[PDB]
Amino acid sequence: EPTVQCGSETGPSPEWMLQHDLIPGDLRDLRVEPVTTSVYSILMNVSWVLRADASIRLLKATKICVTGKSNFQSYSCVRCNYTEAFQTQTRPSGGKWTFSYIGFPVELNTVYFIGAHNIPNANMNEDGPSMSVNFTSPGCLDHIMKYKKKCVKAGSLWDPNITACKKNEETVEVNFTTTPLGNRYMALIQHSTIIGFSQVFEPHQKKQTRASVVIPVTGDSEGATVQLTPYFPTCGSDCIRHKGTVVLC
Amino acid sequence: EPTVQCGSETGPSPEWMLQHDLIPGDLRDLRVEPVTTSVYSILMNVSWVLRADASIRLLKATKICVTGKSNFQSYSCVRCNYTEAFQTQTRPSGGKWTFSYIGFPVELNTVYFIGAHNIPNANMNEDGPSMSVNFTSPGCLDHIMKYKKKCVKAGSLWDPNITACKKNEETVEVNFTTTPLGNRYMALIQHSTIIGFSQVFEPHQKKQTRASVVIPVTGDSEGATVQLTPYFPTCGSDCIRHKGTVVLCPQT
Amino acid sequence: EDGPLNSRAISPWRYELDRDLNRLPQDLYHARCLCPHCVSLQTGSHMDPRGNSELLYHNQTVFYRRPCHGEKGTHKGYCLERRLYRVSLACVCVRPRVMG
Amino acid sequence: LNSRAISPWRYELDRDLNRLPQDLYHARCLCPHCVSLQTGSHMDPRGNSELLYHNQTVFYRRPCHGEKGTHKGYCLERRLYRVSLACVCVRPRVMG
Amino acid sequence: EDGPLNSRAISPWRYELDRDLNRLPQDLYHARCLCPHCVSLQTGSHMDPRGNSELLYHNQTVFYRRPCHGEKGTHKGYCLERRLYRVSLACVCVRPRVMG
């Protein structure tokens, strides 16, 4: 009953220094599943189907690895052997052989390109063994996952409580509770173009009451859209935003 | 240098009566090409790409089959053995192994299919090793096959010499040349709807000149197309039809 | 149009594959025609709804093998099992039915 | 990222048997003009997209030039390569 | 606005110097864009607040100095310390992430 034990190994493979007379087969299949760990990080399992058509007579290692491509550029590889020498073209119990693995860290809006091939590979000038699977990871717009501290610092759970109302044909009033996580608030009112703008500076307050800002507007502002952009020292320019409403008082 | 030698054999494979511990691998790719023989027949050269991934250590036959679904439906396919055993992945010259075979009969208006698998075959409860290559052969509307005898009896190369013109508003005159190869003919004209119909009853004539047909019409016949079909006892209802074009005969 | 009769049929029918590891022939190219209504004969592409299309069938002697019934123990074996297999052949479109 | 840029780009497979890593990607943004910020689907032609590149490290192996005869051998030869990173919105170059 | 796109992008971006006695190259520049949002397209001077600018990094190998760890005593010595450096290349106009 063979098993697979793996450790991280990235770099040149010592197998490339020797040209092997006989080479193994390809891989039938490959699929990767996302899981959530208990608390609260995310790790990844990999699944593939080793060849059934007798391609097995010789094989030792199958290294599976990925380049992580976000704003940051990341790449690492995992090399490991199969601990027992195969003799059957399926499980003696039945079905094509299967194995899996865990341990790949996962980040925010990071797309991973995971590809596999058997070890050793072919010499120069033969057919390519390429087999890889593309993937999609979610961001911080999912209702499940507001609980990472990194996104919380972006005020993920913060409720601006924006209440925006029109005083007269030219002045609009907005009310909302302040926050100890930031100091500067701005306002965009968009119906078709920019109708009015203002900037607010306030360090903090212990009472934490609803604010009140006077913002001039041009033309008919009925049915416009209010949007708030909060500044935090951490998120900077990529700070998350929230809607706002327009009502008449 | 192992070579290929094929001998016709269809039926149950002896090797299918025994289960093998190890089975031979798949095939990379199968290509087949249509060729023409010297005289005047059409044949096919099949070609396949054999494995390099250690599957050459054991493989003895590579059964290749052809099926067609036309008026006929046929299944007779040849098993081919490999003369010599292999000890290496590629020739000392090098390159991917490619093999060929000629001799499968080919006919007209047919869609064929080609199978692929090797001998011995897989045991029970295993992966399907088959790959597909599809193909199609031409008929007798091309210049190169204008000399095919069967469709020659059908009138592959005949010249209709169709000339039809409007006699008047209620009659259209048609002129064309016949041949002893036909004895009964039909007659239709269609412009937007069926505007005229008839049949031609004339076995043959000795001196063999152009004909003349009187056909009534329902309304205007200008701009229509003339269509005539022979009734040949061999081609039956599968008989080719030649186009036509009507003109105006002026009273002057 | 010109072609092997499946490009000139009113209800053209394609030829799709099935696999078995213990059947002869390994493929039985069945017909599954999409055409639900007799196409117009002045076009070869137009959709004419005046007809209903249906399949035609026959039963073909085929070959199956399951392992030997007896526990001989010498080898797995097989049996020379003859049972008839259901196959569609060719499409025709037909006049529908009238109620009232 | 690439689902959010004003000139989005995708990544196309380019495999080799002699490049480390075995896979590299050259982005070609499909946009000949920068998209509109108000709709995200309407085509705004006032901009253009131009590829951004750098130069990166890759590795190759050649068989030994010296006729050793013991084996094919290997060498860690190092030349450079050109690969893109992204597309930028550019104000055109006009004359008149 | 004309130039090597460093003034022509909707997200203009200057340079800042980074000096060091033992980097090869001694010159690395960090992109430090200057706008809080993307510039306007129809005027070239007025300010368009719906966009954001973000850095895009990459890894380019450089060389550093430590003295020889072994106490040879011949001289202070030097070594080719080979690790990476993270720099910025271009600020880009991006559609932000908004919840609601």
Author numbering:
A (entry chain I): 19 to 57, 62 to 271
B (entry chain L): 19 to 57, 62 to 274
C (entry chain H), E (entry chain G): 78 to 177
D (entry chain E): 82 to 177
Pull verbatim passages from the article behind this deposition.
During 2D classification of the IL-25–IL-17RB dataset, we observed classes of higher-order IL-25–IL-17RB structures. Further classification and refinement revealed arrayed trimers of 2:2 IL-25–IL-17RB modules. We refined these particles to produce a map with a global resolution of 4.39 Å. The higher-order IL-25–IL-17RB complex consists of a core IL-25–IL-17RB homodimer flanked by a homodimer on each side. Although there is, in principle, the potential for continued polymerization beyond this arrayed formation, we did not see classes beyond three homodimers. These IL-25–IL-17RB homodimers are connected by interactions between the membrane-distal tips of the IL-17RB type III fibronectin D1 domains. The physiological relevance of this higher-order trimer of homodimers is not clear, but given that IL-17RB alone is not able to support signalling, we speculate that this is not a signalling active assembly. Single-molecule intensity analyses suggested that higher-order clusters are formed as observed in vitro, yet at a rather low level (less than 10% of the co-diffusing fraction). This low level of higher-order clustering is consistent with the values seen in our cryo-EM samples, in which approximately 18% of particles form higher-order clusters. Reduced IL-17RB dimerization of the L40A;R46E mutant could be explained by these residues contributing to the formation of the higher-order IL-25–IL-17RB arrays.
The IL-17 family of cytokines and receptors have central roles in host defence against infection and development of inflammatory diseases. The IL-17 family of cystine-knot cytokines consists of six members: IL-17A–F, which exhibit differential binding specificities to five receptors, IL-17RA–E. The most well-studied IL-17 cytokines, IL-17A and IL-17F, are produced by T helper 17 (TH17) cells and are elevated in the context of inflammation. IL-17E (also known as IL-25) is a key regulator of type 2 immune responses and driver of inflammatory diseases, such as allergic asthma, and requires both IL-17 receptor A (IL-17RA) and IL-17RB to elicit functional responses. Thus, IL-17RA serves as an organizing hub mediating IL-17 family signalling at the membrane by acting either as a direct receptor for IL-17 ligands or as a co-receptor.
